[PDB]
Amino acid sequence: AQSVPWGISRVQAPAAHNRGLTGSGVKVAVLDTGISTHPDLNIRGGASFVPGEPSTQDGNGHGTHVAGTIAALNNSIGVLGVAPSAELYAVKVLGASGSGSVSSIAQGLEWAGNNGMHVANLSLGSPSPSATLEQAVNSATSRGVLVVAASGNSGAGSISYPARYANAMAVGATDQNNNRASFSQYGAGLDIVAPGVNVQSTYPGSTYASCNGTSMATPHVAGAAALVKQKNPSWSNVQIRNHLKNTATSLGSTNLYGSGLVNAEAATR
Ligand SMILES: *Cc1ccc(-c2ccc(C)cn2)nc1
Ligand SMILES: [Ca+2]
Numbered sequence: 001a002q003s004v005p006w007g008i009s010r011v012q013a014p015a016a017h018n019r020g021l022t023g024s025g026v027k028v029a030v031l032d033t034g035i036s037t038h039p040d041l042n043i044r045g046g047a048s049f050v051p052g053e054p055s056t057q058d059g060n061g062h063g064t065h066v067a068g069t070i071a072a073l074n075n076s077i078g079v080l081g082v083a084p085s086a087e088l089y090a091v092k093v094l095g096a097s098g099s100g101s102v103s104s105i106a107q108g109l110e111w112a113g114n115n116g117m118h119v120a121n122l123s124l125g126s127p128s129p130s131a132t133l134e135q136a137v138n139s140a141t142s143r144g145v146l147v148v149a150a151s152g153n154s155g156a157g158s159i160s161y162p163a164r165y166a167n168a169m170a171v172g173a174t175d176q177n178n179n180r181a182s183f184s185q186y187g188a189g190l191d192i193v194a195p196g197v198n199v200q201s202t203y204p205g206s207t208y209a210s211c212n213g214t215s216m217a218t219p220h221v222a223g224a225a226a227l228v229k230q231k232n233p234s235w236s237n238v239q240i241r242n243h244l245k246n247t248a249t250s251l252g253s254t255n256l257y258g259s260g261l262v263n264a265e266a267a268t269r
C-alpha cells in the first residue's frame with residue numbers, strides 16, 4: 001500500500017498528478033550523499049565526486065531521503081514524490097559522513113550542466129561564501145540548470161550559501177501549521193518555502209524514515225519545478241523559478257517566507 005506524506009499533499013502535488021503532470025521527461029540531479037537503490041526509486045544515472053566513494057550509492061541516508069521527496073514512484077508501495085516520473089540522477093558530492101567540499105559540490109554542478117540536467121537539488125550549505133561554489137552555480141545556471149538550495153538549519157535571519165546567491169533558488173522549511181520551522185533560516189535571498197518537519201521519505205535498507213530540515217523542504221520545490229517544466233517544456237530555469245514564486249501562497253511575511261508556500265496546483269494551472 002502507498003502512503004502520501006503530508007508535505008506532498010501540502011504542496012498540492014496530487015492535483016498536478018491528476019492533470020497528467022508527473023515530471024516525465026525532466027532530468028533532476030540530487031547533489032548529496034548519493035542515492036541508494038530502493039524499490040520506490042528509479043535512478044537513471046549519476047556520478048561521484050567524492051574520492052574513496054566511487055559508487056553513487058548512499059552510505060549516509062540523507063540523499064536517499066531527499067530523492068524520495070522529489071521522485072518516489074507512484075505505485076502500490078512506500079511513499080509518493082512531488083514529481084514521481086522525474087528522471088533522477090545521483091550526483092554524489094557529500095561523503096558517508098554527510099560532509100563534502102566546495103570543490104566536490106562544484107564538480108557536481110558542472111556535471112549537471114554538462115549532462116543536460118533541468119534541475120539540481122542542493123540540500124546542503126555553509127554560512128560562508130565560496131568563489132568556487134558561486135562560479136559553479138553560475139556556470140550551471142548558464143547551462144540551463146535550475147539550482148534549488150536549502151536555506152539552512154541555524155534558525156538565523158540570514159541564509160546559507162549557496163542558497164544566498166542570486167542564481168540559486170533558496171528554500172526554507174515550514175511546519176504543519178504553515179509557520180516557519182524554528183530552525184529554518186530566513187532573510188535576504190530567501191525565495192520560497194516548503195514542508196520541512198516530520199517528512200517521511202525513502203531511506204536506505206529499502207525502508208522509509210522521517211526527518212526534519214530545510215534539506216527536506218528543498219526537494220519539494222525541486223519536484224514542483226519538474227512539474228512546471230513538463231507542463232511548459234520551452235521554459236527556461238528563470239521562467240520556472242519566477243512562476244513558482246508568482247504562484248506560491250503568501251504566508252504573511254516576505255522576510256520569513258520569501259514568496260510563500262510552494263503550490264504545485266497553482267503552478268500547473
Ligand atoms: C541506523 C539509523 C537509521 C535511521 C536513521 C535516520 C532516519 C531518519 C533521519 C532524518 C535521520 N536518521 N539514522 C540511523
Ligand atoms: Ca510509491
Ligand code: NI
Ligand atoms: Ni540518523
